[PDB]
Amino acid sequence: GSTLDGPYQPTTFNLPIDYWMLIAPTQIGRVAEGTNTTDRWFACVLVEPNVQNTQREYVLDGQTVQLQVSNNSSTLWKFILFIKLEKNGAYSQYSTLSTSNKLCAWMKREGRVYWYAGTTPNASESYYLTINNDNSNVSCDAEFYLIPRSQTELCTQYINNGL
Ligand SMILES: CC(=O)N[C@H]1[C@@H](O[C@H]2[C@@H](O)[C@@H](CO)O[C@H](O)[C@@H]2O[C@@H]2O[C@@H](C)[C@@H](O)[C@@H](O)[C@@H]2O)O[C@H](CO)[C@H](O)[C@@H]1O
Structure with a gap:
């Protein structure tokens, strides 16, 4: 089988730059979030088919918020x-990943957070937001793996085909 660095237990940590955090939830709802503490609070949630x-309500940045969601895939x-853009602001939707594999991934690099988007088996790291803070913490409700940038091809493989 594939051999990845992990699984790590859910935690909050300063995700090092140039590593894919491949997150592997078992439950729907909030999966992970992060922030630069100034102008980006980002979160991913998982929605089941149909x-x-x-x-739905999610607890994002500690606050219970109602967000519009849907998943028309059977x-x-x-x-x-x-993402929300200020501490007291509301979240807007920026990207999605439709997947048969239930894995998502992001990386801190170039002052950005890159994110796998699209529809498997053709998801790719086509989306990013700007954080300009290499010490931005991430918190995770799921087990996760870390994949060095040198193995981006493998991250792409796992997102699209599973481990
Ligand atoms: C939410 C956020 O932080 N957006 C950044 C980001 O915006 C980019 C980025 O999301 C890419 C991903 O593929 O898509 C666009 O390029 C987007 O830029 C924004 O939309 C485009 C069409 C332009 O109008 C652009 O001016 C606009 O910013 O990165 C940019 C910098 O490259 C900004 O830092 C955004 O705030």
Whole structure:
């Protein structure tokens, strides 16, 4: 089988730059979040297949918020990437990953957070947000793995085909 660095237990830590954090939730709902503490608070949530347009509650940056979500796929899971731009602001939707594999991944590099988006088996690191803070903490509700940038091809393989 594939050999990855992990699984690590859910935690909050200063994710080092140039590593994919491949997150592997077992449950729907909040999966992970992070912030530069100044102008980006980002979060991903997992939605099961066959979910009509609805409002669900998530606890993001410690606060209970209602967010509009949907997943019209009969078979694919969906990660949704939400971001708020100021401490007291509301989250907007920026990207999604529709997947048969239930894995998502992000990396801190070049002052950005890169994120795998699209639909498996053709998801790719096509989305990013700007954080300009290499010491931005991430918190995770799921087990996760770390993959060096030199193995981006493997991260892409895992996102799209599973471990
Ligand atoms: C939420 C956030 O932090 N956005 C950054 C980010 O914005 C980029 C980025 O999301 C890429 C990902 O593929 O898509 C765009 O390029 C986006 O830029 C924004 O949209 C485009 C079309 C332009 O109008 C651009 O001016 C705009 O910023 O990176 C940029 C810098 O490259 C900003 O830092 C955003 O705030």
